Tab-separated table of C-alpha atoms in Angstrom:
chain	number	residue	atom	x	y	z
A	1	UNK	CA	22.389	7.740	-26.483
A	2	UNK	CA	18.858	8.685	-25.454
A	3	UNK	CA	16.090	7.318	-23.267
A	4	UNK	CA	12.330	7.817	-23.227
A	5	UNK	CA	9.911	6.508	-20.594
A	6	UNK	CA	6.240	7.063	-19.870
A	7	UNK	CA	5.327	8.527	-16.485
A	8	UNK	CA	1.879	7.791	-15.029
A	9	UNK	CA	-0.112	9.480	-12.226
A	10	UNK	CA	-0.429	7.265	-9.172
A	11	UNK	CA	-4.040	8.289	-8.488
A	12	UNK	CA	-6.932	10.394	-9.769
A	13	UNK	CA	-5.492	13.598	-8.231
A	14	UNK	CA	-2.027	13.413	-9.835
A	15	UNK	CA	-0.527	13.264	-6.329
A	16	UNK	CA	2.699	11.890	-7.848
A	17	UNK	CA	3.957	10.173	-10.987
A	18	UNK	CA	5.677	6.798	-11.383
A	19	UNK	CA	8.059	5.762	-14.170
A	20	UNK	CA	9.258	2.164	-14.714
A	21	UNK	CA	12.979	1.595	-14.122
A	22	UNK	CA	14.972	-1.578	-14.824
A	23	UNK	CA	17.519	-2.441	-12.108
A	24	UNK	CA	19.974	-5.332	-12.152
A	25	UNK	CA	20.586	-8.438	-14.248
A	26	UNK	CA	18.185	-9.964	-15.088
A	27	UNK	CA	16.131	-6.780	-14.948
A	28	UNK	CA	13.978	-6.069	-11.914
A	29	UNK	CA	11.414	-3.433	-12.896
A	30	UNK	CA	10.396	-0.996	-10.149
A	31	UNK	CA	8.093	2.003	-10.506
A	32	UNK	CA	9.989	5.036	-9.200
A	33	UNK	CA	9.002	8.617	-8.411
A	34	UNK	CA	11.332	10.813	-10.509
A	35	UNK	CA	12.173	13.741	-8.224
A	36	UNK	CA	14.000	16.845	-9.520
A	37	UNK	CA	14.058	18.096	-5.907
A	38	UNK	CA	16.343	15.384	-4.492
A	39	UNK	CA	19.414	13.432	-5.540
A	40	UNK	CA	19.128	9.869	-4.157
A	41	UNK	CA	17.993	6.816	-6.141
A	42	UNK	CA	16.552	4.608	-3.395
A	43	UNK	CA	14.299	1.556	-3.566
A	44	UNK	CA	12.213	-0.730	-1.440
A	45	UNK	CA	14.253	-3.895	-1.196
A	46	UNK	CA	14.705	-7.344	0.302
A	47	UNK	CA	16.444	-5.491	3.178
A	48	UNK	CA	13.472	-3.272	4.011
A	49	UNK	CA	11.934	-4.010	7.419
A	50	UNK	CA	9.108	-6.388	6.559
A	51	UNK	CA	6.410	-4.540	8.528
A	52	UNK	CA	7.240	-1.409	6.501
A	53	UNK	CA	6.534	-3.037	3.104
A	54	UNK	CA	2.855	-3.102	2.046
A	55	UNK	CA	2.435	-3.940	-1.635
A	56	UNK	CA	5.540	-2.331	-3.152
A	57	UNK	CA	7.761	-4.200	-5.579
A	58	UNK	CA	11.174	-4.788	-4.024
A	59	UNK	CA	14.695	-4.893	-5.415
A	60	UNK	CA	16.569	-8.031	-4.333
A	61	UNK	CA	20.297	-7.439	-4.953
A	62	UNK	CA	21.190	-11.080	-4.274
A	63	UNK	CA	19.259	-12.018	-7.447
A	64	UNK	CA	21.218	-9.547	-9.621
A	65	UNK	CA	24.478	-10.836	-11.079
A	66	UNK	CA	25.667	-7.243	-11.578
A	67	UNK	CA	24.900	-5.972	-8.056
A	68	UNK	CA	27.865	-5.169	-5.810
A	69	UNK	CA	27.760	-3.917	-2.229
A	70	UNK	CA	29.262	-0.429	-1.952
A	71	UNK	CA	31.239	-1.305	1.148
A	72	UNK	CA	30.666	0.923	4.154
A	73	UNK	CA	28.213	3.247	2.412
A	74	UNK	CA	24.996	4.299	4.106
A	75	UNK	CA	22.305	6.834	3.286
A	76	UNK	CA	19.570	8.659	5.174
A	77	UNK	CA	17.198	11.269	3.796
A	78	UNK	CA	14.354	13.449	5.053
A	79	UNK	CA	11.962	15.199	2.693
A	80	UNK	CA	10.045	18.459	2.965
A	81	UNK	CA	6.834	16.581	3.808
A	82	UNK	CA	8.412	15.008	6.898
A	83	UNK	CA	8.878	11.573	5.326
A	84	UNK	CA	12.218	9.763	5.449
A	85	UNK	CA	14.143	6.605	4.590
A	86	UNK	CA	17.609	5.142	5.107
A	87	UNK	CA	19.746	2.091	4.387
A	88	UNK	CA	22.852	0.779	2.608
A	89	UNK	CA	24.069	0.973	-0.979
A	90	UNK	CA	24.738	-1.261	-3.965
A	91	UNK	CA	25.995	-0.401	-7.394
A	92	UNK	CA	24.119	-2.012	-10.254
A	93	UNK	CA	22.973	-1.495	-13.821
A	94	UNK	CA	19.985	0.848	-14.138
A	95	UNK	CA	18.048	1.529	-17.344
A	96	UNK	CA	15.339	4.119	-17.988
A	97	UNK	CA	13.418	3.960	-21.249
A	98	UNK	CA	16.277	2.247	-23.084
A	99	UNK	CA	19.092	4.367	-21.598
A	100	UNK	CA	21.506	2.294	-19.500
A	101	UNK	CA	23.925	3.367	-16.751
A	102	UNK	CA	26.361	0.839	-15.312
A	103	UNK	CA	27.680	1.279	-11.790
A	104	UNK	CA	24.739	3.388	-10.628
A	105	UNK	CA	24.400	3.749	-6.871
A	106	UNK	CA	21.130	2.024	-5.892
A	107	UNK	CA	20.311	2.908	-2.303
A	108	UNK	CA	18.549	-0.003	-0.630
A	109	UNK	CA	16.098	0.987	2.085
A	110	UNK	CA	16.373	-0.734	5.433
A	111	UNK	CA	13.788	1.645	6.921
A	112	UNK	CA	11.076	3.861	5.414
A	113	UNK	CA	8.608	6.178	7.128
A	114	UNK	CA	4.906	5.483	7.295
A	115	UNK	CA	3.905	7.587	4.292
A	116	UNK	CA	6.139	5.491	2.026
A	117	UNK	CA	4.768	2.237	3.457
A	118	UNK	CA	1.214	3.527	2.981
A	119	UNK	CA	1.770	4.276	-0.722
A	120	UNK	CA	1.836	0.885	-2.423
A	121	UNK	CA	2.275	2.420	-5.891
A	122	UNK	CA	5.724	4.014	-5.328
A	123	UNK	CA	8.627	1.542	-5.152
A	124	UNK	CA	11.262	4.226	-4.509
A	125	UNK	CA	12.595	7.541	-5.746
A	126	UNK	CA	14.963	8.530	-8.565
A	127	UNK	CA	16.570	11.860	-7.738
A	128	UNK	CA	17.302	14.341	-10.518
A	129	UNK	CA	18.556	17.390	-8.595
A	130	UNK	CA	22.284	18.091	-8.395
A	131	UNK	CA	24.547	15.388	-7.010
A	132	UNK	CA	25.822	17.739	-4.291
A	133	UNK	CA	22.565	16.899	-2.442
A	134	UNK	CA	23.112	13.123	-2.516
A	135	UNK	CA	23.087	11.716	1.033
A	136	UNK	CA	25.417	8.710	0.642
A	137	UNK	CA	28.180	8.695	3.246
A	138	UNK	CA	31.158	8.650	3.440
A	139	UNK	CA	31.454	8.863	-0.377
A	140	UNK	CA	28.731	10.949	-2.018
A	141	UNK	CA	27.246	9.357	-5.144
A	142	UNK	CA	26.071	10.698	-8.484
A	143	UNK	CA	22.527	10.810	-9.803
A	144	UNK	CA	21.391	8.720	-12.757
A	145	UNK	CA	21.417	11.851	-14.937
A	146	UNK	CA	24.936	12.846	-13.851
A	147	UNK	CA	26.207	9.346	-14.635
A	148	UNK	CA	24.423	9.253	-18.025
A	149	UNK	CA	25.252	12.811	-19.079
A	150	UNK	CA	28.476	12.193	-20.985
A	151	UNK	CA	26.844	9.424	-23.058
A	152	UNK	CA	23.733	11.421	-23.944
A	153	UNK	CA	23.320	13.025	-27.355
A	154	UNK	CA	22.638	16.309	-25.513
A	155	UNK	CA	23.142	16.802	-21.745
A	156	UNK	CA	19.455	17.334	-20.990
A	157	UNK	CA	16.353	15.659	-19.703
A	158	UNK	CA	12.759	16.804	-20.137
A	159	UNK	CA	9.652	16.464	-17.992
A	160	UNK	CA	6.253	16.367	-19.735
A	161	UNK	CA	3.801	15.557	-16.965
A	162	UNK	CA	0.170	14.913	-17.858
A	163	UNK	CA	-2.985	16.291	-16.273
A	164	UNK	CA	-4.984	13.208	-15.297
A	165	UNK	CA	-3.070	11.393	-18.031
A	166	UNK	CA	0.296	9.760	-18.769
A	167	UNK	CA	3.288	11.846	-19.793
A	168	UNK	CA	6.962	11.388	-20.634
A	169	UNK	CA	10.483	11.776	-19.281
A	170	UNK	CA	13.074	11.987	-22.059
A	171	UNK	CA	16.858	11.845	-21.614
A	172	UNK	CA	19.333	13.237	-24.124
A	173	UNK	CA	17.021	14.934	-26.617
A	174	UNK	CA	14.269	17.533	-26.927
A	175	UNK	CA	11.106	16.215	-28.637
A	176	UNK	CA	10.086	19.198	-30.746
A	177	UNK	CA	6.645	17.635	-31.369
A	178	UNK	CA	5.826	17.678	-27.638
A	179	UNK	CA	5.289	21.416	-27.184
A	180	UNK	CA	3.831	24.461	-28.909
A	181	UNK	CA	5.586	27.720	-29.607
A	182	UNK	CA	9.189	28.090	-28.502
A	183	UNK	CA	11.075	27.088	-25.361
A	184	UNK	CA	12.054	29.993	-23.100
A	185	UNK	CA	15.236	29.350	-21.144
A	186	UNK	CA	16.013	30.935	-17.791
A	187	UNK	CA	19.030	30.976	-15.510
A	188	UNK	CA	19.561	28.390	-12.763
A	189	UNK	CA	21.416	28.707	-9.483
A	190	UNK	CA	22.892	25.425	-8.250
A	191	UNK	CA	24.064	26.918	-4.933
A	192	UNK	CA	21.417	25.009	-2.924
A	193	UNK	CA	21.646	21.857	-5.078
A	194	UNK	CA	18.242	22.467	-6.725
A	195	UNK	CA	16.983	23.500	-10.153
A	196	UNK	CA	16.515	26.983	-8.692
A	197	UNK	CA	15.314	29.827	-10.927
A	198	UNK	CA	13.486	33.168	-10.754
A	199	UNK	CA	10.001	33.587	-12.183
A	200	UNK	CA	9.264	37.062	-13.510
A	201	UNK	CA	5.764	37.372	-12.023
A	202	UNK	CA	2.198	36.112	-12.053
A	203	UNK	CA	-1.407	36.747	-12.997
A	204	UNK	CA	-4.669	35.447	-11.520
A	205	UNK	CA	-7.311	34.464	-14.046
A	206	UNK	CA	-7.830	37.197	-16.614
A	207	UNK	CA	-6.165	39.776	-14.362
A	208	UNK	CA	-3.203	41.935	-15.201
A	209	UNK	CA	0.266	40.463	-14.908
A	210	UNK	CA	2.243	41.509	-11.831
A	211	UNK	CA	5.958	41.847	-12.507
A	212	UNK	CA	7.827	40.575	-9.460
A	213	UNK	CA	10.754	38.205	-8.995
A	214	UNK	CA	9.858	34.851	-7.399
A	215	UNK	CA	12.819	32.597	-6.641
A	216	UNK	CA	11.898	28.929	-6.451
A	217	UNK	CA	12.726	25.375	-7.470
A	218	UNK	CA	11.435	23.165	-10.267
A	219	UNK	CA	10.454	20.083	-8.250
A	220	UNK	CA	8.710	17.130	-9.890
A	221	UNK	CA	8.620	15.354	-6.512
A	222	UNK	CA	6.323	17.958	-4.931
A	223	UNK	CA	2.610	17.794	-5.789
A	224	UNK	CA	1.518	21.392	-5.311
A	225	UNK	CA	2.624	24.950	-6.154
A	226	UNK	CA	4.051	26.755	-3.094
A	227	UNK	CA	4.412	30.535	-3.442
A	228	UNK	CA	4.758	33.606	-1.213
A	229	UNK	CA	1.795	34.376	1.040
A	230	UNK	CA	1.045	37.634	-0.790
A	231	UNK	CA	0.715	35.803	-4.128
A	232	UNK	CA	-1.367	32.956	-2.700
A	233	UNK	CA	-3.714	35.387	-0.917
A	234	UNK	CA	-4.267	37.279	-4.169
A	235	UNK	CA	-5.154	34.020	-5.924
A	236	UNK	CA	-7.632	32.666	-3.361
A	237	UNK	CA	-9.287	36.071	-2.936
A	238	UNK	CA	-10.769	35.446	-6.395
A	239	UNK	CA	-12.553	32.254	-5.224
A	240	UNK	CA	-15.777	32.846	-3.324
A	241	UNK	CA	-15.664	31.042	-0.013
A	242	UNK	CA	-11.974	30.136	-0.094
A	243	UNK	CA	-10.108	30.434	3.194
A	244	UNK	CA	-6.900	29.341	4.876
A	245	UNK	CA	-7.676	26.602	7.407
A	246	UNK	CA	-5.094	25.955	10.121
A	247	UNK	CA	-6.911	22.730	11.026
A	248	UNK	CA	-6.692	21.424	7.459
A	249	UNK	CA	-3.236	22.894	6.848
A	250	UNK	CA	-3.757	25.299	3.971
A	251	UNK	CA	-6.238	26.953	1.680
A	252	UNK	CA	-9.542	25.169	1.085
A	253	UNK	CA	-12.421	26.211	-1.159
A	254	UNK	CA	-15.987	25.098	-1.922
A	255	UNK	CA	-15.939	22.051	-4.158
A	256	UNK	CA	-18.769	23.714	-6.124
A	257	UNK	CA	-16.412	26.519	-7.231
A	258	UNK	CA	-14.905	27.012	-10.672
A	259	UNK	CA	-11.275	27.998	-10.137
A	260	UNK	CA	-9.469	30.758	-12.039
A	261	UNK	CA	-6.297	30.006	-13.922
A	262	UNK	CA	-2.867	31.042	-12.610
A	263	UNK	CA	-0.129	32.375	-14.901
A	264	UNK	CA	3.575	32.441	-14.040
A	265	UNK	CA	6.302	34.271	-15.920
A	266	UNK	CA	9.378	32.710	-17.499
A	267	UNK	CA	11.373	35.661	-18.766
A	268	UNK	CA	9.025	37.447	-21.159
A	269	UNK	CA	6.998	34.250	-21.677
A	270	UNK	CA	3.963	33.038	-19.745
A	271	UNK	CA	2.804	29.587	-18.629
A	272	UNK	CA	-0.913	29.297	-17.856
A	273	UNK	CA	-2.058	26.750	-15.263
A	274	UNK	CA	-5.766	26.026	-15.951
A	275	UNK	CA	-8.052	26.389	-12.977
A	276	UNK	CA	-8.965	22.705	-12.919
A	277	UNK	CA	-5.293	21.819	-12.283
A	278	UNK	CA	-5.560	23.643	-8.927
A	279	UNK	CA	-8.421	21.450	-7.612
A	280	UNK	CA	-7.131	18.670	-5.331
A	281	UNK	CA	-10.558	17.455	-4.359
A	282	UNK	CA	-12.346	16.864	-1.078
A	283	UNK	CA	-10.260	17.271	2.063
A	284	UNK	CA	-11.787	13.992	3.253
A	285	UNK	CA	-13.982	11.509	1.460
A	286	UNK	CA	-17.389	13.021	0.760
A	287	UNK	CA	-16.564	16.507	2.039
A	288	UNK	CA	-17.724	19.562	0.117
A	289	UNK	CA	-14.553	21.419	1.138
A	290	UNK	CA	-11.809	20.965	-1.453
A	291	UNK	CA	-8.062	21.347	-1.063
A	292	UNK	CA	-6.265	24.019	-3.074
A	293	UNK	CA	-3.357	23.297	-5.364
A	294	UNK	CA	-1.654	26.641	-4.680
A	295	UNK	CA	-0.431	27.038	-1.105
A	296	UNK	CA	1.786	29.376	0.883
A	297	UNK	CA	5.518	28.677	1.083
A	298	UNK	CA	5.850	30.921	4.151
A	299	UNK	CA	6.610	27.939	6.409
A	300	UNK	CA	8.946	26.121	3.978
A	301	UNK	CA	11.707	28.662	3.391
A	302	UNK	CA	11.638	28.189	-0.392
A	303	UNK	CA	9.082	28.566	-3.163
A	304	UNK	CA	8.333	25.307	-4.976
A	305	UNK	CA	7.168	24.948	-8.587
A	306	UNK	CA	5.755	21.462	-8.084
A	307	UNK	CA	3.665	19.263	-10.335
A	308	UNK	CA	0.700	21.700	-10.432
A	309	UNK	CA	2.943	24.190	-12.229
A	310	UNK	CA	5.241	21.848	-14.141
A	311	UNK	CA	2.451	19.760	-15.692
A	312	UNK	CA	1.192	22.910	-17.463
A	313	UNK	CA	4.488	23.042	-19.384
A	314	UNK	CA	7.095	21.092	-21.303
A	315	UNK	CA	10.147	21.546	-19.073
A	316	UNK	CA	13.803	21.228	-20.113
A	317	UNK	CA	16.386	20.481	-17.418
A	318	UNK	CA	19.547	21.566	-19.237
A	319	UNK	CA	22.624	20.053	-17.575
A	320	UNK	CA	25.177	21.797	-19.751
A	321	UNK	CA	28.270	23.219	-18.051
A	322	UNK	CA	26.143	26.203	-16.999
A	323	UNK	CA	22.748	24.609	-16.267
A	324	UNK	CA	19.523	26.321	-17.308
A	325	UNK	CA	15.787	25.560	-17.298
A	326	UNK	CA	13.481	25.816	-20.311
A	327	UNK	CA	9.694	26.113	-20.327
A	328	UNK	CA	7.281	25.821	-23.254
A	329	UNK	CA	3.530	25.699	-23.447
A	330	UNK	CA	2.025	22.484	-24.764
């Protein structure tokens, strides 16, 4: 089997992407944030504290003839941005772009933190990291991809995120019309539960490529590109007026600037992030100070190849017995 679904930016900055997902019988369609940095499929629901729902579409398990309470199971998750959610668990039928999994754990939120409530466009998350990170207790549950894998034509999914435009998540096949050149594959460590790999270096604008190993994660659920302080300093030093602002919480730059591109290495290959992809707009409405899309990871503990980086590429998440990642230009 295969599946193919369009993913759409939630706003004009590409802060996140939503993909429609059918849950239950008859189908309830919710728009979920596909997140290769986590491993829980959780949804706003009829059980979510009412004051914490503000415009999201909810899953109501009592209206699904295929929903079954997973007795005793609870979940609770906290994300790198400080947001969180928790609740109980049903199993139900879940379909993405024509690909159907029966018995998928659907984690029903009883509580969500303010940032989830405040984002009316995201109805939940669909985790695509390794199932060892799933938070369901006392019996850990498998991701949608793990459950689908055996049925797929090939044990892969691909992320093709658009810049200010829709893109595609495919399951079970590699669309050879969706990229240019060849796909370069690189080794993955699953030891932390992430799609963790090692970039071979970077360049800033038209500058020379610096060969240096940068370990990080391919994370569709993170907006920006988080890299070591040395790398980020070298980038912003090429932008007149850019500075790190403790009050704002990262590098800012004059909105009148034209940003240089940023290149990262995948083996001997190179992915170029155009400068415009690194502009995240005014720090506050009407400000002439703009927020940078490349930021230091020094306070995170891990480097993160988020949407800024991934949307410059066609990305293969290869879930073969030894997982790997593939990157192509597009």
